[PDB]
Design an enzyme around this catalytic site. Structure first.
Site, PDB file in Angstrom:
ATOM      1  N   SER A 152      63.631   6.814  13.440  1.00  0.00           N
ATOM      2  CA  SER A 152      62.208   7.026  13.444  1.00  0.00           C
ATOM      3  C   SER A 152      61.780   7.561  14.797  1.00  0.00           C
ATOM      4  CB  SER A 152      61.499   5.674  13.246  1.00  0.00           C
ATOM      5  OG  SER A 152      61.674   4.881  14.409  1.00  0.00           O
ATOM      6  N   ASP A 153      60.620   8.192  14.833  1.00  0.00           N
ATOM      7  CA  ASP A 153      59.957   8.394  16.104  1.00  0.00           C
ATOM      8  C   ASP A 153      59.516   7.001  16.545  1.00  0.00           C
ATOM      9  OD1 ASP A 153      58.561   9.354  18.366  1.00  0.00           O
ATOM     10  OD2 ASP A 153      57.879  11.133  17.277  1.00  0.00           O
ATOM     11  N   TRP A 154      59.074   6.877  17.797  1.00  0.00           N
ATOM     12  CA  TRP A 154      58.965   5.546  18.408  1.00  0.00           C
ATOM     13  C   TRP A 154      57.758   4.769  17.868  1.00  0.00           C
ATOM     14  CZ3 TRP A 154      63.257   7.382  19.227  1.00  0.00           C
ATOM     15  CH2 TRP A 154      64.170   6.965  20.249  1.00  0.00           C
TER      16      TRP A 154
END
EC number: 3.2.1.21
Lengths: 810, 833
Positions: free
Chosen positions: B223-225
């Site tokens: 995932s992105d953060w």
């Protein structure tokens, strides 16, 4: 009122709003000092108030179990019981009781079948409504549970109850409908299971379409404990509060991140749930003057009084069902020469296992109730053992002999016995040490050193025992004897009078927790049966006390069969042979097969009687209370006769409710399947007769008057008038007849009373029309049948209905 | 080799499996020591490697920004850039790089428009693919991001990109398709946003049906953060790992309770995610000998070397695009008499803002570049300011103004406390950069779930001029700015939200003070972190106030007294940053007035512009010399010098359309998240596909750039097989002074399609270097299906349609020099790669 829901909702910030959607700990909601919102304490359960601890629990009043309570068929008495539960709750400073319970015994083997009321939805719903009235009249909040279809224990967190909308409506939702309509419970607790594919605790159909849009019920829903399964769906779909704390699904980060990312829920969903939680705290706060509840208050035994004792004894006595009594064997006379026999005779089987049980002020065994009644020592023999595991060590362990030198001492430690150079200390009185809700500063792993001295009272073999979750070692005379786990045993020879040292080195569940170390005198099983027979032959009468206990019937698993345990049946056959004038008293929450029934001339079902169980049993046996309970459940001859025989297991994660609307006596009457004892059956020491003495139907109401008379000339007694309805010419398949009214009437010898039963037709004769999605009052001819059991119909009246009605709601 | 995915998967217990499904912290995965599974370190970004922290970070090699890199149109060089990035990443002991970035500039205003490659998916794909091969050929894993449709910043965590399947396929998925097909990245990072109503990070369609079932890619998705939004649907639907740690959505309790309650997921789903994580780990483990990465290793500057500097300078110089050059104003000669003017001249605008940024070894400003070039002082005036906010304080302060302007004494001192000022500090650091960025600040005394702490920032400030100074304070959290222990700036009371901290912190507050030259002043900033109300951060600044009208006058008159003015303008990493989009396409403040007045005074001015995306040049007609330099990384200013002086002959071509006005752009009306959504109304007509279809003239077209030489080209061979297209192109440098590179661009058009198409589409390109008079033949080979397919949204398949097609070969999208036609007899439908 100093508590304004809408004002508060408008002042709470978003984090505070999120903090209200989960409990703080096992028992308490969230305090918000800023706004004058107190922490509210809840407590189990439906048959007495446990408080904030299992281990080292503050003693309390245990009531008879739910199927026993329902067998009273006595609304007024059930209201009285809920009022006493409230007083019991106030003494623990719990503002909300986690009860009553009203799931349905669609089969007999449910591990919590003991805990709910009745296979009949009208009896279950009126018992529920009556307990809740009694609780809430005292200013204490009820929580009716578990909504819905939590009707077996097998794999309950995942079990999918697959059930048609007609059976869901008529049987499973119906006692909740009735409770809501007549008693307005402040809370309802959602079930662990699913219904038709969806966990109840995030089911919009159940939680919102039915409870809110259709029924207009405005209480608070809480999860069963850990019975939440999503973050966003459960909030969107109507679950107001997650228990226990600390929250798993509703942390500030999980919830606000869903909000801020437009994942499923909106701030409006959150406000809707917070609003219901605030309404619940408003009831508690509005009632504080009446109850005196102290926030985070101390727990006491202050309700342990003569008044509480006499009322528990009355409620237990009226729960008792007399099933057989040939040859006037009962009542016993105080001059009868008797022996008491049986595995339950000196047991204290006050309740079933798990969430509904507790630490009692005391429990009177059936043997003690009979000694108390006769005012002298009574001959006894155990007859047979029937324990699932060996306990009894703490209960018989210690120079002084004191009632304060009594038990074992538990000394908690950070590290193992294996490594300690040389924090909590507790006086332990019961062998099952249940550490699940245990907490201390020095804990989240911890260790226990359990010590005392054991003195045998007879010469010979004793079987020592240990079970753990999940590490321990058992030492006797500092020698290792025994190494969630199975039971492991060691048999050793001992000597009357001699002192041994018991020492249990225990390690906590990571090595939550729990353990039981027990001991029992070993017997020769064959010889003890011969001995009971020989003894029974040498007395005028025998009183044989048998049954299950809170280890055979317990939350967490269902029963595997309907058999009595171990050598019970062999014991009973030997005693009946040696003495036909033996009275059998059975304790269980649900039916058990009695294969020797034909030969049993007197038979009493006592259920699990709570603190005064043994005095209530004595009261009935000697005639100081005339038996007046009726079975809240069908009692089939054999397990295989039951409607759920084939679908009472979670298989591939589901349970198909194959019998549909045909549950309990609705099934048996429809098949014309004979049972050992039917719903509503119970005998007395006097005779009664009844007749419908007036009858009147309009377009919307039915009014019935019934004259009842005690025709005996010796005992006063109560009879239960039961009112069933039948459709004689419906287009729709229905049960032969359905309980829709009952009244209990006390009558001196020769006395006559008239009771009145008024009901709306829609209450009496609707079925649920699954295709239209509505209840239907169908035009046609109907029969009202009045009697003293579901079979013993004594007076009937035919009537016509011309006006149809389709309805939803209450 | 000894690292066996299926063996390990069989040996992990359920708790260890779950522990592999999220990162431990901001930058590392889970060590499972008993099975010899190490913590893998990942690091930002697509244009150089930041390492494990923003605040107090280890200096690094910053490359030019994506739009610059794509403008080289040079696959070999981009592949060489990827190799250098890997070596950089090894110096930070990061085994996985979080880049390249390849979202799409459907409109010009995207906050991260600078960071990706191109509005053209063919160029975006081939750039991605080249950079990934570079990195992975050295044994360092690439992470192509963000999958998919993260094409603006506004409300990106909830933004719903609503886009037809045809546009999704032809524009947004396409550079991923090309990267997977040619480069096989080890990882991909999912986007924050939704696509047609579902968060990318739990989209079975994107993450399984397309990535796995159709493309058969076998890498790992991260995932992105914080961009995970459920526990079970993200696990069921294909998101292999959640970042950062500590896990929100995937604690052992949430996962095992979901499993045991038959809520949504099964152990098979968990096993499928763990397996893909193990495969990523196996790549890192099997390359450890080659890379020499050390688990949880130190972070060094060991790659700060001439070889690295030369390469960065070269990469930067080839990204530059020469846009106008009338009257041979350029190349400049050493003996030209010149003044350097502009807000960006002394600026160090090496990169756009956010997660693509880093702490550099050094940055050479354009002014410094021109000074290094001539070997002597260069006349200079600022002309005008164009900062978005005022920083510059840590940079021009000392710890004790008594001791020298030393390394150890230059800056401020930051003390960190568990409690506010109103006890020993748990941490002490010397701050050199005014923007104190605390997002990944790590410390034993800091709860990662509630980063609660305080900063006392101190030192001494000495002004080198008499006059008014404008001090400034910006926060995310709370702060007070005291000058000589008297309160000058309040950022504690009645905060307003403004641009600071990805648009989450406060509007800038300021204070005008009159100061005396040489006088010593005590700066004290008292700061409370985010939870005081992530950690967030703050900026205290100071700048010299100037009279705006006066400085424009002075710049104009100075330009008149020189042969040539070199005017350096543009945007920077605060105007163009992750976190918010630009409001307009304008040059900031008084830039345009400055330019107008300088051009009037000296029409022999070369304008050099630094931006990641297009800006309006309203004076354009009057600018006779115009250079687009982008953001050129460490060596940006030496590269600008190189091109100005003709030491590098300008060889960049625009990776983006440059329209005249904001309102001309396809996404003028739908480049904002409204009611949580963004409707992609232009569909496949993005960038030059739009302008050409509307016949709308732009200031500069995609693929456009000038040289200091001239070129001419001919198609000299063209063959079509049932399967493949072979084109030969002869390119000649027809000038007599400068060697140079030309970029041959190959476009295709469907002439009688049943479906609306773009006028033409880039499907091939080659860059060729030619000495004066030299001639060369470049060969372009390509499969038909990838040159002339469109995506048939109704049938759900790509379609090679029967009919006639045109190939256009040129040196920009608007400069076609030779065409050829061919006929396709038999149609083909296809899926996959």
């Amino acid at each position: 009122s100093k508590f304004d829901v809408e004002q508060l909702l408008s002042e709470l910030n978003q984090d505070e709003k999120i903090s209200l959607l989960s409990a703080v700990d096992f028992w308490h909601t969230k305090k918000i000092e800023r706004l004058g919102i107190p922490a509210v304490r809840v407590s189990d359960g439906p048959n007495g108030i446990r408080g904030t601890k299992f281990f080292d629990g503050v003693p309390s009043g245990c009531f008879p179990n739910g199927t026993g309570l329902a067998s009273t068929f006595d609304r007024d008495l059930l209201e009285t019981a809920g009022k006493l539960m409230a007083k019991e709750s106030i003494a623990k400073n719990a503002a909300v009781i986690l009860g009553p319970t009203t799931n349905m015994q669609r089969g007999p083997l449910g591990g919590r079948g003991f805990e709910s009321f009745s296979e009949d939805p009208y009896l279950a719903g009126m018992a529920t409504s009556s307990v809740v009235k009694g609780m809430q009249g005292e200013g204490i909040a009820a929580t009716v549970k578990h909504f819905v279809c939590n009707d077996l224990e097998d794999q309950r967190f995942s079990s999918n109850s697959i059930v048609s909308e007609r059976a869901l409506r008529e049987i499973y939702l119906e006692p909740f409908r009735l409770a809501v309509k007549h008693a307005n419970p402040v809370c309802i607790m959602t079930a662990y299971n699913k219904v038709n594919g969806e966990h109840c605790s995030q089911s919009k159909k159940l939680l919102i379409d039915i409870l809110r849009d259709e029924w207009k019920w405005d209480g608070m829903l809480m999860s069963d404990w850990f019975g939440t399964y999503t973050t966003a769906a459960a909030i969107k779909n109507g679950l107001d509060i997650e228990f226990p704390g600390p929250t798993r699904w509703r942390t500030r980060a999980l919830v606000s991140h869903s909000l801020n990312s437009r994942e499923q829920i909106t701030t409006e969903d959150v406000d809707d749930r917070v609003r219901q939680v605030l309404k619940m705290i408003k009831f508690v706060v509005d009632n504080l003057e009446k109850t005196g509840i102290v926030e985070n208050g101390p727990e006491s035994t202050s309700n342990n009084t003569k008044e509480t004792s006499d009322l528990l004894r009355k409620i237990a006595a009226d729960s008792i069902v007399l099933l057989k009594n040939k040859n006037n064997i009962l009542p016993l006379k105080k001059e009868d020469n008797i022996i008491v026999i049986g595995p339950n005779a000196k047991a204290k089987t006050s309740s079933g296992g798990g969430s509904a049980s507790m630490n009692s002020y005391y429990v009177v065994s059936p043997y003690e109730g009979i000694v108390n009644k006769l005012g002298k020592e009574v001959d006894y023999t155990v007859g047979a053992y029937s324990h699932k595991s060996i306990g009894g060590l703490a209960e018989s362990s210690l120079k002084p002999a004191d009632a304060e030198n009594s038990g074992l001492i538990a000394k908690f430690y950070s590290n193992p016995v294996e490594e300690r150079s040389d924090f909590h200390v507790t006086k332990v009185n019961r062998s099952n040490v249940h550490l699940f809700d245990f907490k201390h500063e020095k804990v989240d792993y911890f260790f226990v050193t359990l010590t005392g001295q054991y003195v045998p009272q007879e010469d010979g073999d004793y079987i020592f025992s240990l079970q753990v979750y999940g590490s321990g070692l058992f030492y006797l005379n500092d020698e290792l004897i025994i190494d969630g786990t199975k039971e492991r045993t060691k048999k050793l020879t001992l000597k009357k009078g001699q002192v041994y040292n018991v020492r249990v080195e225990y390690g906590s569940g990571p090595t939550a927790g729990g353990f039981q170390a027990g001991v029992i005198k070993a017997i020769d099983d064959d010889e003890e049966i011969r001995n009971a027979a020989e003894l029974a032959a040498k007395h005028d009468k025998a009183v044989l006390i048998i049954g299950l206990n809170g280890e055979w019937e317990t939350e967490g698993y269902d029963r595997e069969n309907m058999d009595l345990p171990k050598r019970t049946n062999e014991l009973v056959r030997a005693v009946l042979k040696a003495n036909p004038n033996t009275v059998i008293v059975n304790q269980s929450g649900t039916p058990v097969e009695f294969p020797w029934l034909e030969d049993a001339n007197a038979l009493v079902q006592a259920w699990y009687g709570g603190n005064e169980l043994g005095n209530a049993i004595a009261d009935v046996l000697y005639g100081d209370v005339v038996p007046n309970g009726k079975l809240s459940l069908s009692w089939p001859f054999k397990l295989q006769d039951n409607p759920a025989f084939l679908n009472f297991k979670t298989e591939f994660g589901r349970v198909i409710y194959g019998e549909d609307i045909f549950v309990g006596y609705r099934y048996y009457e429809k098949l014309q399947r004979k049972v050992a004892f039917p719903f509503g059956y119970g005998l007395s020491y006097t005779t009664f007769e009844l007749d419908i003495s007036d009858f009147k139907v309009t377009d919307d109401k039915i009014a019935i008057s019934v004259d009842v008379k005690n025709t005996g000339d010796k005992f006063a007694g109560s009879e239960v008038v039961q009112v069933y309805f039948s459709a004689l010419n419906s287009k729709v398949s229905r049960p032969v007849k359905e309980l829709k009214g009952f009244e209990k009437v006390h009558l001196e010898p020769g006395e006559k009373k008239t009771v009145n039963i008024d009901l709306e037709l829609k209450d009496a004769i609707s079925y649920f029309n699954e295709e239209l999605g509505k209840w239907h009052v169908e035009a046609g001819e109907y029969l009202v049948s009045v009697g003293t059991s579901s079979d013993d119909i004594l007076s009937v009246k035919e009537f016509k209905v011309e006006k149809e009605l389709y309805w939803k709601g209450l």
